[PDB]
Amino acid sequence: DFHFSAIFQPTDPHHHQTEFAKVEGSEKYVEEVEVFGRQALKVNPEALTILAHRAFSDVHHFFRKDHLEGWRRAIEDPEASDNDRYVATTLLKNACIAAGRVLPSCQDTGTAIVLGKRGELCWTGGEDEKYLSKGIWNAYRYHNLRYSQTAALDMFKECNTGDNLPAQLDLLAVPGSDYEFLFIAKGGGSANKAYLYQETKALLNPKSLRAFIEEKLKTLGTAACPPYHIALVIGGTSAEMTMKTVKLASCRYYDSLPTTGDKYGRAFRDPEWEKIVMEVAQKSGIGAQFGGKYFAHQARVIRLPRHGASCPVGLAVSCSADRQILAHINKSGIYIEQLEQNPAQYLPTSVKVDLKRPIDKVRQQLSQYPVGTRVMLNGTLIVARDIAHAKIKEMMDNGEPLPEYMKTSPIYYAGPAKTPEGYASGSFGPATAGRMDSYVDLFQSHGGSYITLAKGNRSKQVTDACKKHGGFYLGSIGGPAAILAKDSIKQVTCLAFPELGMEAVWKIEVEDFPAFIVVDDKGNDMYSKTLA
Amino acid sequence: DFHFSAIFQPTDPHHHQTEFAKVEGSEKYVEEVEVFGRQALKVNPEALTILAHRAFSDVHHFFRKDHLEGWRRAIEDPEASDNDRYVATTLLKNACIAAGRVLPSCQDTGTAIVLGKRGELCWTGGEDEKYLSKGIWNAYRYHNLRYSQTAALDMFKECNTGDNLPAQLDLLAVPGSDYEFLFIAKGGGSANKAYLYQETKALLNPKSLRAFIEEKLKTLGTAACPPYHIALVIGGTSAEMTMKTVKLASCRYYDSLPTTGDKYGRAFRDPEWEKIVMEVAQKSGIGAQFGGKYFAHQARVIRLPRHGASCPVGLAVSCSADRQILAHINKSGIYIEQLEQNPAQYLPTSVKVDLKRPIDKVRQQLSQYPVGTRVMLNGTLIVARDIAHAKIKEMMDNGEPLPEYMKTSPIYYAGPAKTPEGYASGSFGPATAGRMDSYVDLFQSHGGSYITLAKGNRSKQVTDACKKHGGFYLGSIGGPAAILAKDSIKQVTCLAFPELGMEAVWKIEVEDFPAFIVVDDKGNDMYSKTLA
Numbered sequence A, B: 001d002f003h004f005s006a007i008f009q010p011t012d013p014h015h016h017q018t019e020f021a022k023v024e025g026s027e028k029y030v031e032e033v034e035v036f037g038r039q040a041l042k043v044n045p046e047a048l049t050i051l052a053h054r055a056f057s058d059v060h061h062f063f064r065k066d067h068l069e070g071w072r073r074a075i076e077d078p079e080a081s082d083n084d085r086y087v088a089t090t091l092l093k094n095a096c097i098a099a100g101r102v103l104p105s106c107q108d109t110g111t112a113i114v115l116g117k118r119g120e121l122c123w124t125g126g127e128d129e130k131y132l133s134k135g136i137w138n139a140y141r142y143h144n145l146r147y148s149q150t151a152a153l154d155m156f157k158e159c160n161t162g163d164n165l166p167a168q169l170d171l172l173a174v175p176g177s178d179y180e181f182l183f184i185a186k187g188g189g190s191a192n193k194a195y196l197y198q199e200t201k202a203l204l205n206p207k208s209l210r211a212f213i214e215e216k217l218k219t220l221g222t223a224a225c226p227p228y229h230i231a232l233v234i235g236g237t238s239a240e241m242t243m244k245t246v247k248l249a250s251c252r253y254y255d256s257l258p259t260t261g262d263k264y265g266r267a268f269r270d271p272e273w274e275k276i277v278m279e280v281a282q283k284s285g286i287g288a289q290f291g292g293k294y295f296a297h298q299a300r301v302i303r304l305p306r307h308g309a310s311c312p313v314g315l316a317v318s319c320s321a322d323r324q325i326l327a328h329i330n331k332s333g334i335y336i337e338q339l340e341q342n343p344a345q346y347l348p349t350s351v352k353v354d355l356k357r358p359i360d361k362v363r364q365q366l367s368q369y370p371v372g373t374r375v376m377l378n379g380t381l382i383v384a385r386d387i388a389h390a391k392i393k394e395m396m397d398n399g400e401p402l403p404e405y406m407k408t409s410p411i412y413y414a415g416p417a418k419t420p421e422g423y424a425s426g427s428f429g430p431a432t433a434g435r436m437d438s439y440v441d442l443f444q445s446h447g448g449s450y451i452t453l454a455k456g457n458r459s460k461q462v463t464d465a466c467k468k469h470g471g472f473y474l475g476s477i478g479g480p481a482a483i484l485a486k487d488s489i490k491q492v493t494c495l496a497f498p499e500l501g502m503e504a505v506w507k508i509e510v511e512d513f514p515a516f517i518v519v520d521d522k523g524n525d526m527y528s529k530t531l532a
């Protein structure tokens, strides 16, 4: 009466539907042997370094077809808003710049994540984590990427690791003699939009689930640079299993799962509720960052078994920097997923704001316009994000004044990637505004941060602060870090806190920097209707 | 300049601090060999079946020393409340019954979770998941446990799998030639108290972190049968990594981690913040389920590296059914963690309520007493939990009456384990009340469910309903399922929905069933002060 049923039963477990390229000459890293009558593969662990290096290089300059098709759909759909088409066009042009292999597609070159599946008889010598980490180290050190990892020296004392390590290395033991991989360069902002809900059987009916989806999609907001790949996982054997599943679903790793359940509790994709997620996303009006239809590229919904007392639910997105690559090592060598090298084939007024004026004159000009107005910024921005804000608040709590450089220019929340030789700037797109919300009222009450520039919707405290203090929040397009660096950023200099690395305070000169007035000085917020 | 640093660097990676017993004759399942100059281990996969069967059998009848010591501490501490000592004494006596190897310590025999670490040169034949699942199948089929897994036939249509499968099988590839394991029998209610928070750098200071802990600990409530092993994880490379870490911390799997960080971002335990967590738990007054000092046995706090833009935070507990077992297979055979076989060595005014009356007479008697009154129930209980409530609401939505059996007796939210031969009842302790909160006002408005009996604090809607309709919520002690079955439950009959398995409606005859009045018919709630 015993019947074993694996939870996950993909019809394409080795991902034959994906196109792979062989690393030339890589069959020299492997050797087929036989021990105790069974076939085994000896793998020179230097293959893991080579593979990880190429994976975490390529993934920053090219995209998958299904991601690029979504941007074209947003341009060509008659039901797309004008802002949908504008944002999607910008992202596609950004992808064309990134395809030049110098600038990465986003300044947040992400956390390096490796899902590895080592066959029982795949023999590497066992130092996989070291050799994989060396390849990741190579990719981030020898390319114009960014060191984004923050080490905790104690509970509160932190420093940048300076090399984008440690990686997340999830190496699984599986049958056979091959080594299969999914590499993910996961941005922090989209990682932050991975949510776990602890629900109950009372959720599991059509009316309750639909209302739940409507409520939760809004909480994603625009803070992870939509259009999104939206993944929703209902059920799971534990919270951590639910969240791992929703991550992998967002990477389309589970696309070949069955579409029906059975009495053994196997996982399945639910295309009907995928359609419902897309309808909710489209009718939400949130759009591709600034109102419209293209909140989402596509949706994945995976229904899981559950303990009768339990119903964990995971919701997560893949963002505009949709960065994963499949790979495998076998008797023939090293194979890596082929991404789209020619994104250009998918490619079918505003207010000039002079920032080279007194900030009060800039505030006066912005006050003339409603939320949703598109602006083009020309002049100096002061760049500061999470740690700089915390240090400055800490200074003020010790009686120190708000520094003068926080009062002369708009504050751009951003952290740049490394600058290529001969370039004015590396990739340099915006950070999530909402993480700095707790500082705006304080800084504005001390005569600074009257104008901020970042991406994402903000909390009500920021709307109230801008109305109280005559302030503004400007929304940059989120994601197009390469085209901003190439076309808009003309000069970059470190102004304060150099030891923070990318989180130092910078002074940058920009030209033709596009943004929308998201919050004005009158209590208005262009997200108040769609994200209420 | 490259330096590899593993995130997790336990000083005791193989758990030498744990005592193990070898399965007699199990060296016949293993054979050390040497291939290509390296030491390897051949493992008959039947070893995995034998090991999983014994692990998921033993863990339901015995506990670890640090768990039992916590209950003794709550009994002997002069600062423990009377309710602290009463609950801890009850749980310790329950453990004495479970040690008889017939009744499991809790009716929720949990989800079967396997963390396995297969060495590069540990050769099983590769069918580990099937052979592990067979051993788990054996444990739940041939012992007096419970089938708790719910399969989804489609998004909403569900059935019990009837065998407690599927398991969660997390099998990792690691160096060496051994096979190391952590087996967890995870209750659904404590699995539900695994929470993920998406925080920011603004949290990472002493004042903010302390306030955060005070706020989140209350949201655990009493719904997972405290005293808790409380685990808190600050940081992580992804949501799913944070939640896996907090699970393992709650199992004391990471106890030998370093206690300081470094520039490479290694994980560490923070004993200072473990003490602060314990201080918050004790000063909360929540106590061991019914007010006092012993909200928590102990605390684990792990600080993790993070992407600069990210700060995931995990909070989770191990409950009174604290069930994990370490194991390993090596050249000498199968070794399994030795649990405490003699829990008795740790062992150093109520109102009689006659349920054999019209329910209105029972309500009148209960109305004479304040919340916090300890009560002893004698008579019939009608048993119904999540799916039965959902089915009954569906019937009423179709115009059908609230069933008669929802009106005659107090409703006990519970699902029994299997009945041992010759016993009146299998283990039969209470389910989490809060999951049924959305039905109370509706059912009471239709003349039923005036008295409910379960465990855990409930939402304000239930307090309002009981006051509006003259109802009561009685709190059973959470956890002591074996002693309740042995001493209190005299007769068990299936009443409705037999196809739901443990989730059928039952009619049981009880004697001397202890409970507290948690919500009365006047708007009072004995958790209103401690869980506000």
Ligand code: SF4
Residues within 6 Å of the ligand: A106, A107, A108, A186, A187, A188, A189, A190, A223, A224, A225, A319, A320, A321, A429, A430, A431, A478, A479
């Ligand atoms: S596209 Fe946006 S959310 Fe994604 S990594 Fe870049 S900044 Fe972060």
Ligand code: SF4
Residues within 6 Å of the ligand: B106, B107, B108, B110, B186, B187, B188, B189, B190, B223, B224, B225, B319, B320, B321, B429, B430, B431, B478, B479
């Ligand atoms: S002790 Fe309580 S929380 Fe733990 S498994 Fe049993 S019923 Fe669930």
